[PDB]
Amino acid sequence: GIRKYKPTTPGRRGASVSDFAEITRSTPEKSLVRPLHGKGGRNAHGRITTRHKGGGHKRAYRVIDFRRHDKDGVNAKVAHIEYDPNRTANIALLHYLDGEKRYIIAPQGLKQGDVIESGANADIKPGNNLPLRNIPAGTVIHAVELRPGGGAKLARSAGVSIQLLGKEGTYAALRMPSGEIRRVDVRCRATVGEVGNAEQSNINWGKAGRMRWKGKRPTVRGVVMNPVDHPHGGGEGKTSGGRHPVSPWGKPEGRTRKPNKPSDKLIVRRRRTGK
RNA sequence: AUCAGCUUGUUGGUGGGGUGAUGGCCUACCAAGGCGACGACGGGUAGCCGGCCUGAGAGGGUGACCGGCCACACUGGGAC
RNA sequence: CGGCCAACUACGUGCCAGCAGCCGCGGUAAUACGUAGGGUCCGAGCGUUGUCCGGAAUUACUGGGCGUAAAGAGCUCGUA
RNA sequence: GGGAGACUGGAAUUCCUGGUGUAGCGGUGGAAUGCGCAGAUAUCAGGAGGAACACCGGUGGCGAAGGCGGGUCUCUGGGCAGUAACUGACGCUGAGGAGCGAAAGCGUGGGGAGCGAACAGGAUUAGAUACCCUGGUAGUCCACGCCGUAAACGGUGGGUACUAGGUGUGGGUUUCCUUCCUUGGGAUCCGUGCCGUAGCUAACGCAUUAAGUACCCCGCCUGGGGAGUACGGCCGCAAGG
RNA sequence: UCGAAGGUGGGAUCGGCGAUUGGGACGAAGUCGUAACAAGGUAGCCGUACCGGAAGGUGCGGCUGGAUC
RNA sequence: CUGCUGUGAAUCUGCCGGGACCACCCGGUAAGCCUGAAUACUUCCCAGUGACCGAUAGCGGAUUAGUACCGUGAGGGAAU
RNA sequence: UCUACCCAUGGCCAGGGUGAAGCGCGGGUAAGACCGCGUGGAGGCCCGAACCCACUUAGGUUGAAGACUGAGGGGAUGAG
RNA sequence: GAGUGAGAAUGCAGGCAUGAGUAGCGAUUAGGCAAGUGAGAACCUUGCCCGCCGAAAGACCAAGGGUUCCUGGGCCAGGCCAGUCCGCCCAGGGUGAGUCGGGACCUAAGGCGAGGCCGACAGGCGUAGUCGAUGGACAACGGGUUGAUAUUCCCGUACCCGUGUAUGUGCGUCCAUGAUGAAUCAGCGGUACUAACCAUCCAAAACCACCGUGACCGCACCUUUCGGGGUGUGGCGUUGGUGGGGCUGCAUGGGACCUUCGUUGGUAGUAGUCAAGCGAUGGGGUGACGCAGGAAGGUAGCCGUACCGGUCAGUGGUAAUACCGGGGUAAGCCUGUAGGGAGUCAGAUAGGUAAAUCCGUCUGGCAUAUAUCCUGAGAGGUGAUGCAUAGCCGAGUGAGGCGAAUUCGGUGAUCCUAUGCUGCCGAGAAAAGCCUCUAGCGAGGACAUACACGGCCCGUACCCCAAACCAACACAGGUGGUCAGGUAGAGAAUACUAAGGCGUACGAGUGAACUAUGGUUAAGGAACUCGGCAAAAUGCCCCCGUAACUUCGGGAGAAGGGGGACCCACAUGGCGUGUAAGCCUUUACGGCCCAAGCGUGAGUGGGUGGCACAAACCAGUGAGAAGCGACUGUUUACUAAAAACACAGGUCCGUGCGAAGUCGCAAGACGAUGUAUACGGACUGACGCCUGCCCGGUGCUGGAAGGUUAAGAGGACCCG
RNA sequence: AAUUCCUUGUCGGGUAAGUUCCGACCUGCACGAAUGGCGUAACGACUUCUCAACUGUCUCAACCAUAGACUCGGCGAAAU
RNA sequence: AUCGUAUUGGGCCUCUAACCUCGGACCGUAUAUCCGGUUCAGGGACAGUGCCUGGUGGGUAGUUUAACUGGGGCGG
Ligand SMILES: [Mg+2]
Ligand SMILES: [Mg+2]
Ligand SMILES: [Mg+2]
Ligand SMILES: [Mg+2]
Ligand SMILES: [Mg+2]
Ligand SMILES: [Mg+2]
Ligand SMILES: [Mg+2]
Ligand SMILES: [Mg+2]
Ligand SMILES: [Mg+2]
Ligand SMILES: [Mg+2]
Ligand SMILES: [Mg+2]
Ligand SMILES: [Mg+2]
Ligand SMILES: [Mg+2]
Ligand SMILES: [Mg+2]
Ligand SMILES: [Mg+2]
Ligand SMILES: [Mg+2]
Ligand SMILES: [Mg+2]
Ligand SMILES: [Mg+2]
Ligand SMILES: [Mg+2]
Ligand SMILES: [Mg+2]
Ligand SMILES: [Mg+2]
Ligand SMILES: [Mg+2]
Ligand SMILES: [Mg+2]
Ligand SMILES: [Mg+2]
Ligand SMILES: [Mg+2]
Ligand SMILES: [Mg+2]
Ligand SMILES: [Mg+2]
Ligand SMILES: [Mg+2]
Ligand SMILES: [Mg+2]
Ligand SMILES: [Mg+2]
Ligand SMILES: [Mg+2]
Ligand SMILES: [Mg+2]
Ligand SMILES: [Mg+2]
Ligand SMILES: [Mg+2]
Ligand SMILES: [Mg+2]
Ligand SMILES: [Mg+2]
Ligand SMILES: [Mg+2]
Ligand SMILES: [Mg+2]
Ligand SMILES: [Mg+2]
Ligand SMILES: [Mg+2]
Ligand SMILES: [Mg+2]
Ligand SMILES: [Mg+2]
Ligand SMILES: [Mg+2]
Ligand SMILES: [Mg+2]
Ligand SMILES: [Mg+2]
Ligand SMILES: [Mg+2]
Ligand SMILES: [Mg+2]
Ligand SMILES: [Mg+2]
Ligand SMILES: [Mg+2]
Ligand SMILES: [Mg+2]
Ligand SMILES: [Mg+2]
Ligand SMILES: [Mg+2]
Ligand SMILES: [Mg+2]
Ligand SMILES: [Mg+2]
Ligand SMILES: [Mg+2]
Ligand SMILES: [Mg+2]
Ligand SMILES: [Mg+2]
Ligand SMILES: [Mg+2]
Ligand SMILES: [Mg+2]
Ligand SMILES: [Mg+2]
Ligand SMILES: [Mg+2]
Ligand SMILES: [Mg+2]
Ligand SMILES: [Mg+2]
Ligand SMILES: [Mg+2]
Ligand SMILES: [Mg+2]
Ligand SMILES: [Mg+2]
Ligand SMILES: [Mg+2]
Ligand SMILES: [Mg+2]
Ligand SMILES: [Mg+2]
Ligand SMILES: [Mg+2]
Ligand SMILES: [Mg+2]
Ligand SMILES: [Mg+2]
Ligand SMILES: [Mg+2]
Ligand SMILES: [Mg+2]
Ligand SMILES: [Mg+2]
Ligand SMILES: [Mg+2]
Ligand SMILES: [Mg+2]
Ligand SMILES: [Mg+2]
Ligand SMILES: [Mg+2]
Ligand SMILES: [Mg+2]
Ligand SMILES: [Mg+2]
Ligand SMILES: [Mg+2]
Ligand SMILES: [Mg+2]
Ligand SMILES: [Mg+2]
Ligand SMILES: [Mg+2]
Ligand SMILES: [Mg+2]
Ligand SMILES: [Mg+2]
Ligand SMILES: [Mg+2]
Ligand SMILES: [Mg+2]
Ligand SMILES: [Mg+2]
Ligand SMILES: [Mg+2]
Ligand SMILES: [Mg+2]
Ligand SMILES: [Mg+2]
Ligand SMILES: [Mg+2]
Ligand SMILES: [Mg+2]
Ligand SMILES: [Mg+2]
Ligand SMILES: [Mg+2]
Ligand SMILES: [Mg+2]
Ligand SMILES: [Mg+2]
Ligand SMILES: [Mg+2]
Ligand SMILES: [Mg+2]
Ligand SMILES: [Mg+2]
Ligand SMILES: [Mg+2]
Ligand SMILES: [Mg+2]
Ligand SMILES: [Mg+2]
Ligand SMILES: [Mg+2]
Ligand SMILES: [Mg+2]
Ligand SMILES: [Mg+2]
Ligand SMILES: [Mg+2]
Ligand SMILES: [Mg+2]
Ligand SMILES: [Mg+2]
Ligand SMILES: [Mg+2]
Ligand SMILES: [Mg+2]
Ligand SMILES: [Mg+2]
Ligand SMILES: [Mg+2]
Ligand SMILES: [Mg+2]
Ligand SMILES: [Mg+2]
Ligand SMILES: [Mg+2]
Ligand SMILES: [Mg+2]
Ligand SMILES: [Mg+2]
Ligand SMILES: [Mg+2]
Ligand SMILES: [Mg+2]
Ligand SMILES: [Mg+2]
Ligand SMILES: [Mg+2]
Ligand SMILES: [Mg+2]
Ligand SMILES: [Mg+2]
Ligand SMILES: [Mg+2]
Ligand SMILES: [Mg+2]
Ligand SMILES: [Mg+2]
Ligand SMILES: [Mg+2]
Ligand SMILES: [Mg+2]
Ligand SMILES: [Mg+2]
Ligand SMILES: [Mg+2]
Ligand SMILES: [Mg+2]
Ligand SMILES: [Mg+2]
Ligand SMILES: [Mg+2]
Ligand SMILES: [Mg+2]
Ligand SMILES: [Mg+2]
Ligand SMILES: [Mg+2]
Ligand SMILES: [Mg+2]
Ligand SMILES: [Mg+2]
Ligand SMILES: [Mg+2]
Ligand SMILES: [Mg+2]
Ligand SMILES: [Mg+2]
Ligand SMILES: [Mg+2]
Ligand SMILES: [Mg+2]
Ligand SMILES: [Mg+2]
Ligand SMILES: [Mg+2]
Ligand SMILES: [Mg+2]
Ligand SMILES: [Mg+2]
Ligand SMILES: [Mg+2]
Ligand SMILES: [Mg+2]
Ligand SMILES: [Mg+2]
Ligand SMILES: [Mg+2]
């Protein structure tokens, strides 16, 4: 759950963490690890592509079976629900009957011992990936794909995931966490159940070291920025810039969504906030 | 209790000194407890009693005089 | 010497000067203010003042209540 | 309708989408701020989301008290009648202590249809920082914690034994006119309304579900303000208690 | 060794005073107001939160110590 | 005249040139292709010339010369 | 090749204290919450050298040095 | 005909003056004397004391420089002075590797890049690949040597990489034993194709009865003078078309008739393949990795003891009970302890881009055995009759021969087991090598041993916290890694010392001011000053006791006080370690204790000396208020370190995935190999209370109904 | 007040005196609620004030041993 | 615009054959997430890309911001 840390030092007074009692193994599988490195917020070209992030704690990579489609009709027990920091959620390894173990996203309330099926015959216990032909309308879903068989991309937020609304014709309607409705094929791949670590939103950061570890760099406010560096720069004292806030990269607040996407016709309306 | 914990010779045993007389009265060595919500330790007031006044009684108030003790002798100590 | 409380009339100023333990007494005709008489109480003492009890069953053990005047804690489990 | 979790239903409001359909719709003691001519109101079809369950529904049931009601499942407490098999003084109340607790308020993270403090306008008045109208931010919903106060009222602590009745309701055992249908008649215990004796009370009034007559323990009160306030102590992140 | 007096240093209690401020009661009479007592002209009150010179107003929940029907 | 972008002609009473524009007459035939001679230039070689300098001049360099040296750079850059 | 940032691979931090969760025992409950006792060394924790900084002062300022030296000064298991 | 006339432009280049023989001669260590060479000696050489560093100011490496290394010659030029000396200059000499560092081995960040994509062009990208250590695989010590080089040369003993000899164990292909397995003919899943039977619920072609009455025909009453209309009844009709029976056809379950078996009855274990032994550009394992922390066993190393050799040092006493010096010895080859981990066979399954005896998974059997295997410090033996050493003899720039003892104990690491164990989150590279499996071959390979043989190229001197690198210098600066002795000590601080190297290149004198570095000072203690700036002061360990406030951690080492030296006794005490010996057994590099021996803090008494017993060095000033900033942090290298910045806390907005925003005229890459509890942007800055009013202006988000307007279409009139 | 010109505002505490400081008043030229307001335990080489000790910072300087300054010997600078 | 004859472009709904796909499966390939081709599957006469123009456009660029003045600036 959530465990709050006692104030031993003035720095870690407010630090509270979601204790990971949901851990079973501590040393990740060495076979599936691929060579990875912190890119430092920089491309191969050497320029800093995005500031406020980079540096920190070098970490490893592991392949997740996001698009599980190659093998079907075989069951798998939950091997060990381990901790992968490269995601907000957790990964629970599976012993499939063919002996080919792949990592998958651990759904909410998953504990070691449940049997998971991936295919048409799969039931409604969480972790079962199956096309929309075999799912009731109205069930909460996660790790949702966009086409019948091109790899799953969406619905992997910890705690709130996409909810299926209804099927009409050959197009299916999906409700977004933002409260929006997206039209998607009735043959895409989607799983059942919410994603775990819902209590992760109750994490309290704590200090700056954790944050350089996590990746982000300290944020430099524009009002003290130099005027050449930023439109908010300059001033003798504290000033807001004398104009509406603007990213120093030229454009102010506003529309950024370029229309006319191939899935733009597959969207009914855009998000509305604070209702 | 608009005072909840107090105490370290403090508590208990043994061995010594001590005093007219027993005794942590004093010393050494052993054990950790005794007193505590059937009000401890703290705070304010005040000499106690036979008596006096009041009240049918219960009770309440009080310690004039006398008398039975207690404590003191400008303040604090000590001893022959 | 108004009623509590046995003892009243006249004269002098009228919301002034003043009385007083509770109620309370004077705004031109006071048995309540001041003076006279008159009467009452007490008496070698007479009142005022302060402390204490009684009435005070007004801390109710004898001897109070908790619907509205003051009061049933919000209600249970339950240690001593 | 005792509590908790999950699943599920319909009506209604609002919003969105698409027809039809035209200049008004909403409003009060009267009118104007409000939305329309960019197509409102009305009305049909569909969808979305949130809250709450109209009738049954009552001076009726349960819970110790706050309180509790759309269905369905899951688990569970309390109470009642008969046989009385068994335990054989285990009963009661309970200072300090501990647990539950209306609404509002606070933190974190979500939700948010309607309603609605605060705040804007429009209206009345000499005056409105109100009553009225149009809007609507907390909150009202969910989960975890908190505060622990109400005219928290039956303004009456609990338990036991006794003391005349009449009239309704609910639950269960029996017996008899006996169709053996019948609130038929009778006996019994528990709960809950109303009116009434003796009695009590200053009166209103209570009257077997006592304020009657007693027993056991517990809290509370000693003229009105000051004041349920200052200081001190305890709890709470704070409001505060 | 003990030992009264004296001096070092910080904790409690009783206090006395203290600019100014907060609150209360008594004066009497004046302005601002209509709050409550009759369905007091918005039923009252209680707990609570917000608001306003002021009595008060509103929201939510609770009682009738509320009158008509 | 050429180019980017769209349109788009005739084959000879066809066209475009004749310095916004055309009737009659006047001069040449576009979308295909190339072609020596006069010209510009001199890192190199040869032969000469100079009212050009004679070692702070003349090329930075008559001599260890783009050497020493400075600068990690593109480079700069000596005196003798 | 300094400095700013990042990337990958190595290395560095003498010594001494503070004592979270967790763990077992005895209380507390019906289960808790909680209460003490023994292990724990978690900490951008504490004191303090190597190391990294540069707060004060003096000297120097045609210095030993085109930004230091000497006394003190801060971090010193980490945003190093 | 002029490059034709200088005195200046903080002019240019060269030369030379004064300031002037003035300042300085480069630190917190310091010298003096003797003898020697030399023409000259504080500075060089040799001897004795003194001084300084000694986590360096000693000894090694990397980067860097390149002859500064050694020897011989000389001292006009350089060394801040003379200099016989030098890191000066001239000549000669000096660097020895299968095993130490790189290449023939492989990869990270990143660079190059065939084809290819994009780009007028130049070009930019990146695939297959190839480069790229700061990483990983893979092989040493003691002693000795001359005037300079030593893990390289020699002696002594080994190792592991790679090529060959052939004999000995020994194996099939061309014979054939084994284990099996699999692609062929004949039918069945009371379940239940098709006429029914028993039981149950409902109703299409309205029969009976009642009621309501689209509309029609009307009887009686009311109503306006009669009319519309209203009230009760009758005849239907139903705004609101079944029952009954039969043939026939279809639909639902039964047994059975022809085709679908209980894999063999002959053949064809006759013929065709093959597993040795190498075997992959392929597949799979292994190789393969964090921070922090404690405990245990050991080692380097240190201190004492036995033993071994020597000692008489002009001083009062100690001639051995005392003193000084030794008291060493590797790699490798055996043994496999403490300790860290892990279980064994049979059969089938297709999951690992093809197949698998390999890697996984499921059925079963065997297993809690210190069974079995791997790893693994250390100790013991060999290595070693060897080497070396304290010292004895002749012999001096120096060489040679001989050569004693070589054990116990204790202390003890930051070193080894350890890439381990326990716990935390912030969850900890790649490939080569190695083991093994098959695909594609195949008539000769596999294992040991006597023997002669063959193992590449390059670095190898010297300096390296400095006069040899970077700073223009022989500069008070900077520079990464490895060795870490003794006494006090908590220690790598600090003080003094060993090994070892220096007194670092201007000196000799004179009580001047004055400047700089320090010490002390009557008495007052901030009266100077902007400020207690600077100075001064406390400072260590163990105890006793510590407030206001608070987020219950703190504040707090709060403040303050006491003890601290030496000797003796308690005390042959307690503690650790551990021999002989004892106890025991799966007998071994075994568990228990441990007299003896060694080391050892703590306290209480008694006594003693000084003014002072943490006496040196080293080593917090404390307290009370108020402002800003929550705190640790970072910055104006070289005038300013804060109230600035940043940081965790929150808010708002934009972001639906080849996302937003970027870098890029583009491919492409980051974002992210992440996916609205995630990313970017902006503002504030922990935490408590909160965060009021205002949408005219400017921005942003909605609705474009009206008017204005581009380009392009369109050809009225008019001129010629 | 990090905002206040008059202003050393007025009043109270500290000293002999306090234009600084601390605590209040509001006459806020020209505070103010995310360019955030008010407090806040802890920290700060931050800012300001007071206190005990301490001292040559001072009253008022004196002496002492260093390294220069001085003379001699060797080499030998510059700003202008 | 020349309710039974005419006016050539707008508005929509469709289908695949232009076009798109960072969708799948194969191949070059013995190894290749690049690239190219085929098939299937999704969008589709749209998106995309030019040419012209209208808008927005301190993100970027080149500039300007007088003189007189009893010092300048503010005044005139
Ligand atoms: Mg915090
Ligand atoms: Mg990876
Ligand atoms: Mg950022
Ligand atoms: Mg890094
Ligand atoms: Mg996670
Ligand atoms: Mg910012
Ligand atoms: Mg800035
Ligand atoms: Mg700008
Ligand atoms: Mg600025
Ligand atoms: Mg400003
Ligand atoms: Mg804006
Ligand atoms: Mg949305
Ligand atoms: Mg005694
Ligand atoms: Mg004794
Ligand atoms: Mg009495
Ligand atoms: Mg009495
Ligand atoms: Mg008495
Ligand atoms: Mg007497
Ligand atoms: Mg007596
Ligand atoms: Mg006395
Ligand atoms: Mg006395
Ligand atoms: Mg009378
Ligand atoms: Mg009388
Ligand atoms: Mg009179
Ligand atoms: Mg008389
Ligand atoms: Mg009395
Ligand atoms: Mg009684
Ligand atoms: Mg009473
Ligand atoms: Mg009452
Ligand atoms: Mg009560
Ligand atoms: Mg109460
Ligand atoms: Mg629940
Ligand atoms: Mg509609
Ligand atoms: Mg909603
Ligand atoms: Mg009880
Ligand atoms: Mg009880
Ligand atoms: Mg009690
Ligand atoms: Mg009680
Ligand atoms: Mg509780
Ligand atoms: Mg509510
Ligand atoms: Mg609130
Ligand atoms: Mg909350
Ligand atoms: Mg919330
Ligand atoms: Mg509303
Ligand atoms: Mg508004
Ligand atoms: Mg109630
Ligand atoms: Mg009660
Ligand atoms: Mg009772
Ligand atoms: Mg009666
Ligand atoms: Mg009655
Ligand atoms: Mg009763
Ligand atoms: Mg009573
Ligand atoms: Mg009261
Ligand atoms: Mg208090
Ligand atoms: Mg006072
Ligand atoms: Mg009223
Ligand atoms: Mg009114
Ligand atoms: Mg009212
Ligand atoms: Mg009212
Ligand atoms: Mg209230
Ligand atoms: Mg209100
Ligand atoms: Mg209510
Ligand atoms: Mg009433
Ligand atoms: Mg032609
Ligand atoms: Mg030509
Ligand atoms: Mg160069
Ligand atoms: Mg600890
Ligand atoms: Mg705990
Ligand atoms: Mg400095
Ligand atoms: Mg100076
Ligand atoms: Mg100097
Ligand atoms: Mg320089
Ligand atoms: Mg100093
Ligand atoms: Mg740090
Ligand atoms: Mg000339
Ligand atoms: Mg000149
Ligand atoms: Mg000059
Ligand atoms: Mg001169
Ligand atoms: Mg001089
Ligand atoms: Mg000099
Ligand atoms: Mg020097
Ligand atoms: Mg000499
Ligand atoms: Mg030293
Ligand atoms: Mg050191
Ligand atoms: Mg050392
Ligand atoms: Mg190097
Ligand atoms: Mg020579
Ligand atoms: Mg010479
Ligand atoms: Mg020279
Ligand atoms: Mg030479
Ligand atoms: Mg490339
Ligand atoms: Mg190419
Ligand atoms: Mg490549
Ligand atoms: Mg390479
Ligand atoms: Mg390399
Ligand atoms: Mg060498
Ligand atoms: Mg060597
Ligand atoms: Mg790890
Ligand atoms: Mg020795
Ligand atoms: Mg497998
Ligand atoms: Mg060889
Ligand atoms: Mg070589
Ligand atoms: Mg060298
Ligand atoms: Mg060196
Ligand atoms: Mg140099
Ligand atoms: Mg030097
Ligand atoms: Mg130097
Ligand atoms: Mg260094
Ligand atoms: Mg060390
Ligand atoms: Mg020394
Ligand atoms: Mg030395
Ligand atoms: Mg001087
Ligand atoms: Mg002195
Ligand atoms: Mg003094
Ligand atoms: Mg001053
Ligand atoms: Mg303090
Ligand atoms: Mg403290
Ligand atoms: Mg302290
Ligand atoms: Mg034995
Ligand atoms: Mg045994
Ligand atoms: Mg002494
Ligand atoms: Mg800091
Ligand atoms: Mg900082
Ligand atoms: Mg900087
Ligand atoms: Mg600076
Ligand atoms: Mg600097
Ligand atoms: Mg500075
Ligand atoms: Mg700074
Ligand atoms: Mg700061
Ligand atoms: Mg910050
Ligand atoms: Mg905030
Ligand atoms: Mg923000
Ligand atoms: Mg925001
Ligand atoms: Mg507007
Ligand atoms: Mg505006
Ligand atoms: Mg036209
Ligand atoms: Mg102020
Ligand atoms: Mg100020
Ligand atoms: Mg302030
Ligand atoms: Mg001052
Ligand atoms: Mg002001
Ligand atoms: Mg202002
Ligand atoms: Mg703001
Ligand atoms: Mg602002
Ligand atoms: Mg504060
Ligand atoms: Mg002095
Ligand atoms: Mg003087
Ligand atoms: Mg002297
Ligand atoms: Mg000097
Ligand atoms: Mg001198
Ligand atoms: Mg000189
Ligand atoms: Mg001008
Ligand atoms: Mg002027
Ligand atoms: Mg002038």
PDB file of C-alpha atoms (C1' of nucleotides) in Angstrom, chain J residues 30-76:
ATOM      1  C1'   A J  30      23.249 -17.747 -44.993  1.00  0.00           C
ATOM      2  C1'   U J  31      22.804 -13.890 -41.581  1.00  0.00           C
ATOM      3  C1'   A J  32      19.561  -7.236 -42.426  1.00  0.00           C
ATOM      4  C1'   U J  33      13.517  -3.723 -37.356  1.00  0.00           C
ATOM      5  C1'   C J  34      17.389  -0.167 -43.694  1.00  0.00           C
ATOM      6  C1'   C J  35      15.549  -0.670 -48.510  1.00  0.00           C
ATOM      7  C1'   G J  36      12.887  -2.749 -52.885  1.00  0.00           C
ATOM      8  C1'   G J  37       8.974  -6.237 -54.871  1.00  0.00           C
ATOM      9  C1'   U J  38       4.269  -9.533 -54.460  1.00  0.00           C
ATOM     10  C1'   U J  39      -0.138 -10.890 -51.902  1.00  0.00           C
ATOM     11  C1'   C J  40      -3.696 -10.018 -48.248  1.00  0.00           C
ATOM     12  C1'   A J  41      -5.792  -6.291 -44.937  1.00  0.00           C
ATOM     13  C1'   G J  42      -7.090  -1.073 -43.681  1.00  0.00           C
ATOM     14  C1'   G J  43      -8.058   4.609 -45.274  1.00  0.00           C
ATOM     15  C1'   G J  44      -9.349   6.857 -50.631  1.00  0.00           C
ATOM     16  C1'   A J  45     -10.848  10.364 -55.308  1.00  0.00           C
ATOM     17  C1'   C J  46      -9.813  12.646 -49.396  1.00  0.00           C
ATOM     18  C1'   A J  47      -5.213  13.289 -46.814  1.00  0.00           C
ATOM     19  C1'   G J  48      -0.198  14.638 -49.041  1.00  0.00           C
ATOM     20  C1'   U J  49       2.556  17.741 -52.287  1.00  0.00           C
ATOM     21  C1'   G J  50       3.498  22.494 -55.489  1.00  0.00           C
ATOM     22  C1'   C J  51       1.907  27.401 -57.973  1.00  0.00           C
ATOM     23  C1'   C J  52      -0.802  32.089 -56.555  1.00  0.00           C
ATOM     24  C1'   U J  53      -2.999  34.853 -52.877  1.00  0.00           C
ATOM     25  C1'   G J  54      -5.640  36.418 -48.378  1.00  0.00           C
ATOM     26  C1'   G J  55      -4.876  36.540 -43.413  1.00  0.00           C
ATOM     27  C1'   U J  56      -1.716  35.651 -38.282  1.00  0.00           C
ATOM     28  C1'   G J  57       3.169  36.370 -37.724  1.00  0.00           C
ATOM     29  C1'   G J  58       9.574  40.758 -32.284  1.00  0.00           C
ATOM     30  C1'   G J  59      10.512  33.674 -33.894  1.00  0.00           C
ATOM     31  C1'   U J  60      14.166  36.078 -37.206  1.00  0.00           C
ATOM     32  C1'   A J  61      16.333  40.571 -40.108  1.00  0.00           C
ATOM     33  C1'   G J  62      17.728  45.787 -41.921  1.00  0.00           C
ATOM     34  C1'   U J  63      16.839  50.281 -39.896  1.00  0.00           C
ATOM     35  C1'   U J  64      14.749  55.230 -37.754  1.00  0.00           C
ATOM     36  C1'   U J  65      13.692  57.900 -33.338  1.00  0.00           C
ATOM     37  C1'   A J  66      15.018  66.586 -35.614  1.00  0.00           C
ATOM     38  C1'   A J  67      17.191  71.113 -34.445  1.00  0.00           C
ATOM     39  C1'   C J  68      17.517  75.580 -31.437  1.00  0.00           C
ATOM     40  C1'   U J  69      19.010  75.450 -26.253  1.00  0.00           C
ATOM     41  C1'   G J  70      23.567  80.505 -21.680  1.00  0.00           C
ATOM     42  C1'   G J  71      25.507  71.918 -20.007  1.00  0.00           C
ATOM     43  C1'   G J  72      21.479  68.285 -21.389  1.00  0.00           C
ATOM     44  C1'   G J  73      16.302  66.644 -20.574  1.00  0.00           C
ATOM     45  C1'   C J  74      11.557  68.187 -19.428  1.00  0.00           C
ATOM     46  C1'   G J  75       9.251  73.148 -21.019  1.00  0.00           C
ATOM     47  C1'   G J  76       8.754  76.910 -25.455  1.00  0.00           C
TER      48        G J  76
END
